[PDB]
Amino acid sequence: KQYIISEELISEGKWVKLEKTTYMDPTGKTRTWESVKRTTRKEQTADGVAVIPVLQRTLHYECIVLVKQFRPPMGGYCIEFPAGLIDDGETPEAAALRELEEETGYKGDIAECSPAVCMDPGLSNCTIHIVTVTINGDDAENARPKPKPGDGEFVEVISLPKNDLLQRLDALVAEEHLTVDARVYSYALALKHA
């Protein structure tokens, strides 16, 4: 039933644009929406990746490796899956492994890769691949993980046991001002509900 009639540009920055979207509703009435899009998406299957990094070590409970960063849109620190935009020509798996090493120091192994999933579909066209990666924490490569952050990237690594993820997140939120990402929270909640 529904389709896009037109996309009018309102304002274009270096990274993000706003559009006036005109569409057909299922009654045959024409309507509008205000849409956010990134300016950086070329031939990539998605804007970005987020990495679910499962750190595995013998005689340790598995951990989910998270990162804490200052996020200017939010005006504060956020705890998220390691994540970044996919470079032109890069595969989602390659962007995931690259971002994970850059942000955390870990060299992971691909486990699975989602289709393009939407970040906030009521507002933006932004998509990511959610890529699950296992990190062999017994490998010497992963002993003293050294992050190699890019220009303007400032990251703290936080590894939390998978078996207690939601309580350990609540305990960090209780101790300082800091926002957990919706994807991390959704993942932690499902680990509880299962």
Ligand X SMILES: CC(C)N(C)c1ncnc2c1cnn2C
| Interface with ligand X (CB under 6 A) | 15-16, 33-34, 122-123, 152
Q: Is 8 in the site for a second copy (CB under 8 A)?
A: no
Among 8, 31, 60, 139, binds a second copy (CB under 8 A): 31
Q: Does residue 33 have a known ligand-binding role? A: yes
The burial class, CB within 10 Å (0-12 / 13-18 / 19+), for 169 is buried
Q: Does residue 164 have a known ligand-binding role? A: no
Query: Residue 99 binds which entry of Cl ion, a second copy, Mg ion, none, with Cβ cut-offs from 5 to 8 Å by kind?
Result: Mg ion
Q: Does residue 97 have a known ligand-binding role? A: no
Query: Residue 121 binds which entry of ligand X, a second copy, Cl ion, none, with Cβ cut-offs from 5 to 8 Å by kind?
Result: a second copy
Are the beta carbons of 120 and 126 closer than 8 angstroms? yes
With CA atoms as reference, report the closest residue to 49 among 13, 101, 105: 101
Instruction: Tell how strand 109-113 and strand 83-85 pair up.
Output: unpaired
CA pair distance 95, 50, nearest whole angstrom: 9
CA pair distance 59, 26, nearest whole angstrom: 57
Among 19, 47, 99, 181, binds Mg ion (CB under 5 A): 99
Q: Does residue 71 have a known ligand-binding role? A: yes
In the complex, which residues of this chain contact Cl ion (CB under 5 A)? 54, 111
- Residues pairing with 102 in the sheet: none
CA pair distance 70, 76, nearest whole angstrom: 5
Among 55, 65, 67, 83, binds a second copy (CB under 8 A): 83
- Cβ nearer to Cl ion, comparing 54 with 165: 54
Binding to a second copy (CB under 8 A): which residues in 162-191? 162-163, 170, 173, 179-191
- Cβ nearer to Mg ion, comparing 46 with 83: 83
**Phi/psi at 191 (5° precision):** -60, -40
42's tokens: 């070329």
Binding to Mg ion (CB under 5 A): which residues in 57-96? 83-84
The burial class, CB within 10 Å (0-12 / 13-18 / 19+), for 176 is exposed
Binding residues for Mg(2+), by number, are 83, 99, 103, 153
